[PDB]
Amino acid sequence: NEGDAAKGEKEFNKCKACHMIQAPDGTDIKGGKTGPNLYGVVGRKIASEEGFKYGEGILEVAEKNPDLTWTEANLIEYVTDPKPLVKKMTDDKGAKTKMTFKMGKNQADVVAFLAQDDPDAXXXXXXXXXXXXX
Template identity: 40%
Template sequence: MKNFAIAAALTVFAAPAFAQEDMITFQGDAAAGEEQFNRQCVACHVVQDPETDEVLAGRNAKVGPNLYGVAGRQLGVVEDFNYSDSIVELGETGQIWTEEAFVGYVQDPTGWLREELDNRRARGKMAYQVRQEDEAYDLYAFLATFGDQEAQMEALQAAAEGN
């Protein structure tokens, strides 16, 4: 009986470790990302649950698209938002917001789009640039906490397998 109890306890403690193998981890710190969001992003963006209309982060700003569910979402698809032609074009290729894509974009929106599309005329509408790479990673980790986590993970895993 004692051996059974030990085996059961080990199984319970090991289960989270095995579950973590299928999870995608992000380089950033979500708590630091929340601080960055509240300092850098709230002037233009909101994180608002589209089903309940509850604002989860931000101040109801609508200059930029709603960032609810951005992790794993296809580029340029938030309904009723007027994206640049370049971001829509890239989204039509199936490009999703992976950590790498997000960090590249927020650090240099137009430059990133030009490189991704191989088009020197590509332009983004976002004028702000996150200067520190670690802050961009933190922002993504924070934003990845909002939305359908299972759907986000499936999209991100599919993108990782496709690369």
């Protein structure tokens, strides 16, 4: 749980194919365009990132919770098995997701790494209400 990242990035080898890292400019890692830029996230806002085809669910939830800025404790949950977070949260059963990867062995190890890439947590903040605070 010692959330590495060394191990965390190694594994990213398991998101890379759906997912890009890139920055407002160049690309750390290199990954399929299926899924969004995974860079930033941590600090972000569920589904913000523009010009992608977000699954309708994350979309409505981002909505019910104009709040949610992907901590990385959310990252841990989500990726673990995302429907059960997405869903649960809208309460609307029949999540859907566009993400089907289920990752159940090394969670924090990863959020760790992705916490890092999105360097802004700003030392601290911008809000609070649990789950959010970004």
